[PDB]
Amino acid sequence: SMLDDAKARLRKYDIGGKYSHLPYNKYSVLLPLVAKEGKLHLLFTVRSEKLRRAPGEVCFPGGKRDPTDMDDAATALREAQEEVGLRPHQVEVVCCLVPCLIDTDTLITPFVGLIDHNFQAQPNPAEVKDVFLVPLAYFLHPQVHDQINHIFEYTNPEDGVTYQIKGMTANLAVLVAFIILEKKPT
Numbered sequence: 001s002m003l004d005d006a007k008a009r010l011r012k013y014d015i016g017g018k019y020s021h022l023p024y025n026k027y028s029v030l031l032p033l034v035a036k037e038g039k040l041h042l043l044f045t046v047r048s049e050k051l052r053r054a055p056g057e058v059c060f061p062g063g064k065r066d067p068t069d070m071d072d073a074a075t076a077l078r079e080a081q082e083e084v085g086l087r088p089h090q091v092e093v094v095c096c097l098v099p100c101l102i103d104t105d106t107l108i109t110p111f112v113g114l115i116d117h118n119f120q121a122q123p124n125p126a127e128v129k130d131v132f133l134v135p136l137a138y139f140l141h142p143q144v145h146d147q148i149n150h151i152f153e154y155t156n157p158e159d160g161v162t163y164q165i166k167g168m169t170a171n172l173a174v175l176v177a178f179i180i181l182e183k184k185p186t
């Protein structure tokens, strides 16, 4: 099936815990895959304007590891719960993608999660101003804008609202799209 196909593809890129013990400042993100109308979508947040770190940007759910987290996956799930109300039984963490190095002293670990069909996001307004879905296929033929430096623009056909997606967030979205959708019969 579509969801089993996705999982089996994603597993071939799983690095596991290989890089998880290194002495970095640690941050995790969740890449939430949602099935809707026969197709895969990714879920994104718009960060609250009132935050000190990264106000108003399009990001995946995530945040800084804390002493309670058993591992880097736990960080990603804790933060998704706090931001959009995603509960543990509503998500299956399928793999850990390549981590991103930043600022010489920081390591960001991405996990891909399959989201239960009865989940409905409850944006927490102290953390997140908006939550929206983008079809995974979009990231193979995106609408690109040069700020000269590449930014994606996505317009939701439901309401005509446009979102800007860039940086690490846009890089990871393209990666997941290639993994899952490259070389498939139609």
Ligand SMILES: O[C@H]1C[C@H](c2ccccc2)[C@H]2C[C@@H]3CNC[C@]31N2
Residues within 6 Å of the ligand: 027, 029, 054, 057, 058, 059, 060, 062, 102, 103, 106, 108, 167, 168, 169
């Ligand atoms: O997901 C975090 C991770 C990064 C970070 C986190 C902490 C310190 C430096 C850099 C930067 C890039 C990402 C884009 N949206 C938000 C975001 N911010």
